[PDB]
Amino acid sequence: FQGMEVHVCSVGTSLLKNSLDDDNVRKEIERLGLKDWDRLKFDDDRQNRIKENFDSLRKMLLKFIRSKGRRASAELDSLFSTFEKLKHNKSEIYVFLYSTNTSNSQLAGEVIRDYLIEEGIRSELVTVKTISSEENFYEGIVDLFDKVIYRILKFKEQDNEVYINATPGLKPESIFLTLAGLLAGADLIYYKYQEFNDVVILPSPPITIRPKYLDWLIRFAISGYTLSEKRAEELGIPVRLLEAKMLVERKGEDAYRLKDWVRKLLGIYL
Amino acid sequence: FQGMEVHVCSVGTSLLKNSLDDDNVRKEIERLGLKDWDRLKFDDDRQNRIKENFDSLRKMLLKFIRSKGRRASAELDSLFSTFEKLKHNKSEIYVFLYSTNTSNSQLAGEVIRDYLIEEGIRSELVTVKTISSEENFYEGIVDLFDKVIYRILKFKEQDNEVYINATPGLKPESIFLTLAGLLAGADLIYYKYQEFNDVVILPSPPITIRPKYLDWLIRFAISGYTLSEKRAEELGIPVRLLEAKMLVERKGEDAYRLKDWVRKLLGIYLP
Ligand SMILES: [Mg+2]
Ligand SMILES: [Mg+2]
């Protein structure tokens, strides 16, 4: 599509936590022993309870939102407040949500997506990999490029505006989303402060990779993603500088390998 | 100075919250009705109770850290874990802390600074404006430029490495610190996940303002910070484009004003 106002938003579990204010919901949640379903980790066996009762829980959460309104969740509150601030009309909006492949997050995500659609706002939910260690953190970043950042690219190529809602989600993820999102051409970043109940447009300077580094990185790609130290020397690529910035890693002992996430980043410019 | 490993870190109040585990601290804080001192808002009259008892509370908190270790606060836990990961030695480190000009935050900041110093790590604490509304948000950003980002510029000009600790602090501020910090030449951004007790280096690509925007912004600046529509046209500046990205604002009958924070940003690229 073209000419749309696209909002990109991570999915947290404030909806799950907030819903416990409703006695009906709480009762059912207690019957299932899911009192802290908003905090369940990816490997908690109680995720399977959510999964086995997904349809029932979804419909129940939809009832909760319908009655509660935007304050039902941090996603909804920040989204609707920002539509009003920037004067985005329902018929113009596309809400792009992403959650981890975990039952509790996926439930929040499907409910939020389905409610937006009920309200006349086009919405899509994508699923990304769980980050649970330093090693799989970078695998998660790679997946965010594939599932989210590259979609931002495509939205911009199709002549849409893109607004990043930084309100929900874990800090390190929102920092990445803001950074890579801006490099991919996102227009503005925004954040709703609950403290003073107001939406702020965060400074959104249009940015790009420094030209010298982009040049060096492209040489790396063009030549091969893993390069001997000599080959890299012939190309004028300052490997030790790139290593210090954690863009490449020594693979003993001739070789330097461009990190997977940096390859994805290059995709923005190729 | 030169050749140091400089860590830039915002100051939160996890220290205050964690210290309630110390019976001596907890009973004294209860005496002052400060059980919620970690969440005290900027305009709470009780901030003055912290101020009036600042030196006493500072020593009590120092005793707590001395006994508790790095887990006393998110700052200390993330800093010390990262020194170990990156192999930074105490003699090489400079910890640049910044807190708001509020009693509770400044208390946490001075205690953390003083503790680091006791352990042989050079440290400095600077104070920034409180953000409490959308209007004063941008005044806060401007102050972060003057107090923090411009110091990163100077650390880099004096041949030091700069590492941004994104662990503590409110999300929006950490996002700004990361962006402007990288633009100013910071080397790496890092974050300790408490959940799995490990420090990750966040992706830290070397970045700059897009060239055509930087050109437009510089043309704007050298001509004047508030420009008529007519003059902006003659300079070839697409003011509506800049307005849409919230870099300039329409003022008066026919003028466009470069936002204060954008003027500070340009300071990175001009002298
Ligand atoms: Mg407002
Ligand atoms: Mg590790």
From Swiss-Prot, chain B:
Enzyme class (EC, first level): lyase
Principal location: cytoplasm
Catalytically driven reaction(s): cyclic tetraadenylate = 2 5'-hydroxy-diadenylate 2',3'-cylic phosphate
Subcellular location per the Swiss-Prot or TrEMBL entry: Cytoplasm
GO molecular function, one term: lyase activity
EC numbers on record: 4.6.1.-
Site label Transition state stabilizer, positions: K171
GO biological process: defense response to virus
Record text on cofactor binding: Does not require a metal cofactor.
Record GO cellular component, one term: cytoplasm
Alphabetical UniProt keywords: Antiviral defense, Cytoplasm, Lyase
Function recorded in the entry: CRISPR (clustered regularly interspaced short palindromic repeat) is an adaptive immune system that provides protection against mobile genetic elements (viruses, transposable elements and conjugative plasmids). CRISPR clusters contain spacers, sequences complementary to antecedent mobile elements, and target invading nucleic acids. CRISPR clusters are transcribed and processed into CRISPR RNA (crRNA). A nuclease that degrades cyclic oligoadenylates (cOA), second messengers that induce an antiviral state important for defense against invading nucleic acids.
Quaternary structure note: Homodimer.
Family statement drawn from the similarity comment of this UniProt entry: Belongs to the cOA ring nuclease family.
The protein's name in its UniProt record: CRISPR system ring nuclease SSO1393
Protein source organism: Saccharolobus solfataricus (strain ATCC 35092 / DSM 1617 / JCM 11322 / P2) (Sulfolobus solfataricus)
Full protein: residues contained: 1 to 268 of 321
